Amino acid sequence: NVKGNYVQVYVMLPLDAVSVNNRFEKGDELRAQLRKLVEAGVDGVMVDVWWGLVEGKGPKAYDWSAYKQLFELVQKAGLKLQAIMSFHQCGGNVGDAVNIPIPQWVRDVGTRDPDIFYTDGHGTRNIEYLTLGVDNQPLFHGRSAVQMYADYMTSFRENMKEFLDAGVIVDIEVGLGPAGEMRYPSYPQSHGWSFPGIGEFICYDKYLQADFKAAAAAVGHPEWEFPNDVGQYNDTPERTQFFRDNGTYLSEKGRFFLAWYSNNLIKHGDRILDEANKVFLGYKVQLAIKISGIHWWYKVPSHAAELTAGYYNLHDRDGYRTIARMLKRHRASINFTCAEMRDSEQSSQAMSAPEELVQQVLSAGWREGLNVACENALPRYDPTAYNTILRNARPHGINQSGPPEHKLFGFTYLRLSNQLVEGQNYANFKTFVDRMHANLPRDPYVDPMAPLPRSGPEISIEMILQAAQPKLQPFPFQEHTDLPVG
């Protein structure tokens, strides 16, 4: 009996599932594409629920019309639905077809208060997301950012209650930064970063500067400032005194700054997840966050790109198990990425280790008792990619008589297009789904969810950080799947 091996497969809908005008205008095309997903046995779909579309008119002027039409179509296709609370800009980089900023009335606050945006050491403002520094600042016609997020989720729950009750909506992913990821905008691809630069620390907004000053004063070092020996976006670690091997990242001051920077992300996630848990209390849904996959520089001592993204991960410090520990009280899950990548596929100069990073994050989630799901980082249509995903989905292979010791709770494929569902691409994709399902038919009843309980007691940052050390080896992963596409 191999049923416990089944891993659900979701497919991300196009970024334009709802138009930039907040109208649902590609229903017939989508219905035809969803037929192909149903033919393939897919468990459900995933979609961005864009803040800039829904609350674009003004405060609390939510327009759910288009999303309700979309969700009805998905329900009528017999598919489940994962909804992202997308509190960030869609697109805005060079060549992006779909461009949806956060609400204009929110950005208008930035004219008199530009420090509502994450800001770099140059003073450049990133307009894709509101700094965590304004989470509890009542700057937005009397509301704080967290209040806006909570109110949006409340309105979503009220409007989408029938889809929740019917078992259509099964997961809520809470966007926590740029691209919906719990990170800083440290790698701004259209404004001065190119892969594989180290990135930069994006903590110069006046709110975060004041918070650092207070933190530094509480430990008797009022004079401390952010590190200045950090180079710039497109540097490599040895270009800098901070990130080089044996560099200043190791110093007392460096450790304090890195802990402060990464802790703020953890605290941001904790406070917003608490609000999300209160909103969805009693509904049969999983809450999730999305951790960015920063695989470049993983092989060097400083892990520089992870550090600037906000993940304080080193050889001897588990910067993902701390995040996982924070999620535990909420019974929140991790949605990770890079599930399709092999190390051999990456350029040498990027010092990139996606396989090891995936193993680290999955192992950290499992050690904290969490569900862990994953996505592919880049578009792939080939058997090798599918077989890499399969390995990561069941690291120990198939258990012949029960559940395996570890497995992904789900996989979400990025992303649906016409190209996916024709030709050889489609044949490869359908076989993948079969393999993820352990060669069983689709099970509409799989992975039932209990009504969501209230978050457990708030734990301090010090309690969360007990998870950082000692750093443990990952659980063993097979080199290759035992159930390949063929």
Ligand SMILES: OC[C@H]1O[C@@H]2O[C@H]3[C@H](O)[C@@H](O)[C@@H](O[C@H]4[C@H](O)[C@@H](O)[C@@H](O[C@H]5[C@H](O)[C@@H](O)[C@@H](O[C@H]6[C@H](O)[C@@H](O)[C@@H](O[C@H]7[C@H](O)[C@@H](O)[C@@H](O[C@H]1[C@H](O)[C@H]2O)O[C@@H]7CO)O[C@@H]6CO)O[C@@H]5CO)O[C@@H]4CO)O[C@@H]3CO
């Ligand atoms: O809309 C842009 C992009 O958004 C999303 O991508 C994320 C991605 O999930 C993150 O992992 C990160 O990407 C990193 C990579 O992880 C990192 O390896 C590196 O990427 C390099 C690739 O490794 C290398 O193959 C090559 O990429 C090619 C690739 O062969 C092509 O597929 C093509 O990419 C286009 C995609 O087809 C298209 O979907 C879209 O990309 C989305 C992506 O789907 C989504 O998941 O547009 C791109 C065109 O840029 O061409 C590229 C050549 O550029 O080279 C890159 C080196 O740049 O670095 C990236 C970050 O640059 O971040 C992205 C962005 O949020």
